[PDB]
Amino acid sequence: GAWKNFWSSLRKGFYDGEAGRAIRR
Question: Which domain of life does the protein's organism represent (predicted)?
Answer without folding.
Answer: Bacteria
